[PDB]
Amino acid sequence: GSGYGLGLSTRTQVTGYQFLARRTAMALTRWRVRMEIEPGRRQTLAVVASVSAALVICLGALLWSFISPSGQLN
Amino acid sequence: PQAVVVGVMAGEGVQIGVLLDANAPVSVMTDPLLKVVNSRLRELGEAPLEATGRGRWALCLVDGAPLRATQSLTEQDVYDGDRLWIRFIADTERRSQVIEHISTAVASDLSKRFARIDPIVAVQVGASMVATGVVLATGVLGWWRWHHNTWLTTIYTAVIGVLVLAVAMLLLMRAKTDADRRVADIMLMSAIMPVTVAAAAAPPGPVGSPQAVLGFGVLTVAAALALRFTGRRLGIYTTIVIIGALTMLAALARMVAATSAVTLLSSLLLICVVAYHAAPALSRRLASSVRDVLLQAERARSFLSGLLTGLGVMVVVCMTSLCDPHTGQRWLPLILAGFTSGFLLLRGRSYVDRWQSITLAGTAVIIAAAVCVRYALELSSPLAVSIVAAILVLLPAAGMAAAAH
Amino acid sequence: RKPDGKDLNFGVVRVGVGMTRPEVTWGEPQNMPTDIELEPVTGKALQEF
């Protein structure tokens, strides 16, 4: 066959694809593939940290609301 | 018609006059022709033409484009008195490279066809950004002077002008190559604007005619000074001097005494109208021995282009101001603008240069369009905008058809 | 062209262009893992190569 259609796949196959994507994405931007350091991942994780920190503050704001109820004009 | 005489160029630059058969196919003549030019080179004592590795002998236009080997010389658009070039053209056949893994292929390919950034261009970018920053600085400093009569505007702008001029002097002296000179020129030209408004802002009281006299005056001097000591970037400096000079005359008259702006604008229009005829004479006179002649030639061509540009800017400003849609015989200036535009539209053919002819043709089009748009803004109504739209859309359509047909 | 044994071009004629085997000789990878044991990325890479 030719791998057509939806299906099933292993974890080993998933990281393999996820690696080829990063390597090729680098080529279009830096024109080289030695990847001595992999800035692509580092830059993405910073976004995750930014979103995560925002959610933590939302959880913080949610607990204060149960400790001391109040209300605002609407 | 059986034969045509043409000049054939051979190795490294010798030109030889030959009488060729007008109907035999070109491929039949290239071989014996090569023998003849070599014989003359051998008699002159020069190096004869020889083959190198893989390639072939061809007959080409001076532009390098080769002639079809099977067509007759008369079958091609070659006329008696023209010139041709005999040449050796090398073989281009070679192996075809391949790379199966896509990621590596994209990098090895993409890095050949495009140019990456380098330190040489980088300085021009930074230089370009500082030039833009200061012209922005003068704008906000100038806007403040329109509401306040304090010395701040001249005080602040003067120090900037000095500092900018200061840096340029060092670069001009340290410069070594054309790239280096570009950086210096951009820096130097950027100083004129702050120095100019710094002076014009000095006279106290509400801004107007008295301040205008200072600005356009120092501007003219500054441009003339830079042109005199630098001798480079002729086209742009020429334009600044022209527009500065004519504007100072109007400013001085309006400052001393003037019955109406229409009078001054009309005078300027006439001066500009006659200047177009004088421009070529002015330009020609303003300008191993071959070096001097070629330098002289481009300097002259440069002056005319800038000269034409300076005149074009003044007429559109005056013309659009004169054809007021409410003042008196509203139809009189409209048709006069037409006659003035027709003259420029026809006169464009008198000049051989591509850019010179385009600016003239465009000068007429821009006047008509600018004039037409004003009648949509003022004396506004559905009829006016509807008519302005129809005129403006048809106008160029007719010109393009008349030129392409 | 000379017929004296050492000139390998004698009797040879050009007919066009095409594909050919390079002068290089490739050595098989020793101790090849079984197909169920193969890694997916490097497997295809070596296969295409």
Curated annotation (Swiss-Prot), chain A:
From-to range in the entire protein, with total length: 10 to 83 of 506
Comment field (misc): Part of the eccB5-eccC5 operon, which is essential for in vitro growth.
Name the UniProt record assigns to this protein: ESX-5 secretion system ATPase EccB5
Residue numbers on the Cytoplasmic membrane side: 1-46
Transmembrane residue ranges: 47-67
UniProt family annotation: Belongs to the EccB family.
Subunit structure: Part of the ESX-5 / type VII secretion system (T7SS), which is composed of cytosolic and membrane components. The ESX-5 membrane complex is composed of EccB5, EccC5, EccD5 and EccE5.
Annotated gene: eccB5
Protein function: An ATPase (shown for residues 80-506). Part of the ESX-5 specialized secretion system, which is responsible for the secretion of EsxN and a number of PE_PGRS and PPE proteins, including PPE41.
Compartments, record wording: Cell inner membrane
Highest taxon in the source lineage: Bacteria
UniProtKB/Swiss-Prot annotation, chain B:
Keyword Transmembrane set for record: yes
InterPro entries: EccD_transm (IPR044049), T7SS_EccD (IPR006707), YukD-like (IPR024962)
GO cellular component, one term: plasma membrane
Pfam family, one: EccD
Membrane protein topology class: Multi-pass membrane protein
Main location: membrane
Effect of loss of the gene: Mutants are defective in the secretion of EsxN, PPE41 and PE_PGRS proteins. Mutant is highly sensitive to detergents and hydrophilic antibiotics such as ampicillin, vancomycin and bacitracin. Virulence is attenuated both in macrophages and in the severe combined immune-deficient mouse infection model.
Superkingdom of this protein's organism: Bacteria
Keywords: Cell inner membrane, Cell membrane, Membrane, Transmembrane, Transmembrane helix, Transport
Compartment list: Cell inner membrane
Transmembrane segments: 120-140, 152-172, 183-203, 207-227, 233-253, 255-275, 303-323, 326-346, 357-377, 383-403
Binding partners and assembly: Part of the ESX-5 / type VII secretion system (T7SS), which is composed of cytosolic and membrane components. The ESX-5 membrane complex is composed of EccB5, EccC5, EccD5 and EccE5.
Additional notes on this entry: Was identified as a high-confidence drug target.
Known role: Part of the ESX-5 specialized secretion system, which is responsible for the secretion of EsxN and a number of PE_PGRS and PPE proteins, including PPE41.
Family from the record: Belongs to the EccD/Snm4 family.
Name used for this protein in its record: ESX-5 secretion system protein EccD5
Organism: Mycobacterium tuberculosis (strain ATCC 25618 / H37Rv)
UniProtKB/Swiss-Prot annotation, chain C:
Traits of the deletion mutant: Mutants are defective in the secretion of EsxN, PPE41 and PE_PGRS proteins.
Organism: Mycobacterium tuberculosis (strain ATCC 25618 / H37Rv)
Cell compartments where the protein resides: Cell inner membrane
Note: Part of the eccB5-eccC5 operon, which is essential for in vitro growth.
Listed name of the protein: ESX-5 secretion system protein EccC5
Span of the entire protein shown here: 151 to 199 of 1391
Quaternary structure annotation from Swiss-Prot or TrEMBL: Part of the ESX-5 / type VII secretion system (T7SS), which is composed of cytosolic and membrane components. The ESX-5 membrane complex is composed of EccB5, EccC5, EccD5 and EccE5.
Superkingdom: Bacteria
Function: Part of the ESX-5 specialized secretion system, which is responsible for the secretion of EsxN and a number of PE_PGRS and PPE proteins, including PPE41.
